[PDB]
Amino acid sequence: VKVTQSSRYLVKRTGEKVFLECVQDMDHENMFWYRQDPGLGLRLIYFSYDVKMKEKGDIPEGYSVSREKKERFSLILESASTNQTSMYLCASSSTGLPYGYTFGSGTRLTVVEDLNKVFPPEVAVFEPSEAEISHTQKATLVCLATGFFPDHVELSWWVNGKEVHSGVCTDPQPLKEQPALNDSRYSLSSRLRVSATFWQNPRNHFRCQVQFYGLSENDEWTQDRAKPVTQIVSAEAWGRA
Amino acid sequence: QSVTQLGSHVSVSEGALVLLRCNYSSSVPPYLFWYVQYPNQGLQLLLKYTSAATLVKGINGFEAEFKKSETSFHLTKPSAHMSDAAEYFCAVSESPFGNEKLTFGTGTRLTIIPNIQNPDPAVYQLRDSKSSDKSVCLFTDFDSQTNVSQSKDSDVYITDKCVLDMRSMDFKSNSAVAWSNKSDFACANAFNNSIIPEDTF
């Protein structure tokens, strides 16, 4: 019981034809391609009730679709533009089974007019203020990610090489470094807080890990900068005396 | 055949009542479902029903009454929990198992406000001593009453508040980050707005 989409994030350029895949291990008749946008909820683009079949959704425009084998359904963007930047959600279901939909986990497609605009984040950790430690006996490390495009990052802390989900919080959204500029770069922050004792134990390793999703190996450029591919950019810190 | 969710953003206090509106139209007998979406990209079934009853319990302590009189299926939970913070979606189908196409509403983002008990707001200045030039400000430990304003200086960047939970210590704290590349700037004056006389430095 998995619905699996070919990719989790993708970057593409304006005018370009674009292909997305979805696969399902349940022998399901039905497959559905939706997109998701802020304030618009979910909106059905296209659907298929059998192999080789398709019907148009509530918003089929600029989209073509293809069902070829019973296990996979493809979405095709006729020609990318910014108003097709979205979260793309596949789902399948069976007409007989009583289980409703199973959703996959989505792919975020951002489209841009100019491919030299995409950059990976640089990542820093800042050490607790001794003032905080003195006043509160806790210790808040800050993690900072800057100079990234598009808005495609996943930031995670690891204490002693083991991911933590406690004493953490990260900006629900990023912010614009240069808010006038149509294609401005982004910044995101996170916070990891621990007891001052833990921070004052130089056995303990704290690592900020950012995961960035940029260009694929296929895409091309010859700008002097490193190809801004998918990659994990971290930063580190050691406990203190 | 159609759904709407009045109110796209709901913010409520920890332990306060959650209500998330849904109302529907259908030429044909309707069947409804609620989904919830987290940072974990895909939607998941929160609740549904067969017509075996009218008040329906869902997962994560939620509930919804199918009032056909009112054409509604509002979602409720008596007492909000921090992990209820998520996005929620009401859907309608012609199939009683939701097999054949669902129509989704516009969604309602749900934001829970933490209850800070013994606040003591402070502004701290951090660095990574071997980050060249660069250092950051941390405004933290403020009541939920407090809000952080946007910046008024090209080089001054300021984030919104964000809550963390050290579950080991039954301890929550709000926090907001600020920084600038302008060397003629300190933490002392970065946050100017909705800021209290009782601040440590």
DSSP string of chain B?
A: -EEE-S-SEEEEETTSPEEE--EEE-SS--EEEEEEE-SSSSEEEEEE--TT-SEEE-STT-EEE-BTTTTB--EEESS--GGG-EEEEEEEESSTTS-S-EEE---EEEEEEP--SS---EEEEEE-TTSSS-EEEEEE---TT--PPPPSSTTEEEPPPEEEEEGGGTEEEEEEEEEES-SS--GGGT--SS--S--B-
Contact A140, A192 (CB under 8 A): yes
DSSP H/E element including A133: helix A130-136
DSSP H/E element including A130: helix A130-136
* Residues facing residue A23 across a β-bridge: A4, A72
Q: Which two tokens stand for residue B173?
A: 């704290």
Find, among A188, A148, A129, A99, the residue nearest to B93 by Cα.
A99
Contact B36, B46 (CB under 8 A): yes
Structure-determination approach: X-ray
For testing the chain A interface, which of B164, B168, B182, B187 should be mutated: the one with the most A CBs within 10 Å? Answer: B164
Q: Which two tokens stand for residue B107?
A: 């969604």
Distance from CA of A115 to the nearest CA of B (A): 26
- CA A217 to CA B154: how far, in whole Å? 36
- CA B7 to CA B87: how far, in whole Å? 12
Domain that residue A66 falls in: 2-113
Cβ–Cβ of B5/A41 closer than 8 Å?
yes
Kindly state whether residues A224 and A118 are assigned to the same domain. Answer: yes
Kindly state whether residues A79 and A17 are assigned to the same domain. Answer: yes
Kindly state whether residues B121 and B154 are assigned to the same domain. Answer: yes
Q: Which residue of B has its CA nearest to A38?
A: B106
Kindly state whether residues B143 and B52 are assigned to the same domain. Answer: no
Domain that residue B134 falls in: 115-200
- Domain boundary among the residues A113, A129, A146 is at A113
Kindly state whether residues A49 and A104 are assigned to the same domain. Answer: yes
Taking each continuous run of H as one helix and of E as one strand, the counts in chain A are: 2, 21
CATH of the domain at A49: 2.60.40.10
Kindly state whether residues B74 and B127 are assigned to the same domain. Answer: no
Kindly state whether residues B51 and B120 are assigned to the same domain. Answer: no
The three-class DSSP label of residue A135 is helix
- CA B123 to CA B140: how far, in whole Å? 7
The 3-state DSSP composition of chain A as helix, strand, coil percent (nearest 5) reads 5, 50, 40
Cβ–Cβ of A124/B175 closer than 8 Å?
no
- CA B131 to CA A94: how far, in whole Å? 56
- Domain boundary among the residues B77, B99, B114 is at B114
- CA A41 to CA A5: how far, in whole Å? 20
- Parallel, antiparallel, or unpaired: how do β-strands A63-69 and A72-77 relate? antiparallel
Kindly state whether residues B181 and B194 are assigned to the same domain. Answer: yes
Whose structure tokens read 């301890």? B171
- CA A166 to CA A169: how far, in whole Å? 9
Question: What was the resolution (in A) of this experimentally determined structure?
Answer: 2.5
Kindly state whether residues A33 and A151 are assigned to the same domain. Answer: no
Find, among A31, A110, A53, the residue nearest to A77 by Cα.
A110
Cβ neighbors of B31 (< 8 A, separation 6 or more) are: B48, B49, B92, B93, B94, B95, B96, B98
Nearest by CB: B42 against A97, A103, A141? A103
Kindly state whether residues A182 and A123 are assigned to the same domain. Answer: yes
- CA A17 to CA A116: how far, in whole Å? 19
Distance from CA of A81 to the nearest CA of B (A): 23
Contact B160, B176 (CB under 8 A): yes
Contact B62, B76 (CB under 8 A): yes
- CA B7 to CA B192: how far, in whole Å? 31
Kindly state whether residues B108 and B120 are assigned to the same domain. Answer: no
Cβ–Cβ of B97/A177 closer than 8 Å?
no
Cβ neighbors of B159 (< 8 A, separation 6 or more) are: A171, A175, A189, B148, B176, B177, B178
Q: How many domains does chain A have?
A: 2
Kindly state whether residues B105 and B124 are assigned to the same domain. Answer: no
Kindly state whether residues B93 and B153 are assigned to the same domain. Answer: no
Binding-face residues of B in 36-55 toward A, CB within 8 A: 40-45, 48
- CA A171 to CA A151: how far, in whole Å? 13
Kindly state whether residues A107 and A120 are assigned to the same domain. Answer: no
Nearest by CB: A135 against B99, B122, B160? B122
Kindly state whether residues B52 and B5 are assigned to the same domain. Answer: yes
Cβ–Cβ of B106/A131 closer than 8 Å?
no
Cβ neighbors of A83 (< 8 A, separation 6 or more) are: none
Q: Residue A225 burial by CB count (10 A; 0-12/13-18/19+): exposed, middle or buried?
A: exposed
- Parallel, antiparallel, or unpaired: how do β-strands A122-126 and A138-148 relate? antiparallel
Kindly state whether residues B110 and B121 are assigned to the same domain. Answer: no
Kindly state whether residues A109 and A129 are assigned to the same domain. Answer: no
- CA A145 to CA A121: how far, in whole Å? 6
Q: How many domains does chain B have?
A: 2
Residue type, A233: V
* B135 close contact with A: CB closer than 8 A: yes
- Domain boundary among the residues B62, B97, B114 is at B114
- Domain boundary among the residues B79, B114, B149 is at B114
Kindly state whether residues B74 and B21 are assigned to the same domain. Answer: yes
* B81 close contact with A: CB closer than 8 A: no
Return the ∠ at Cα B145 (arms to B139 and B150), rounded to 5°: 50
Q: Which two tokens stand for residue B161?
A: 């508040």
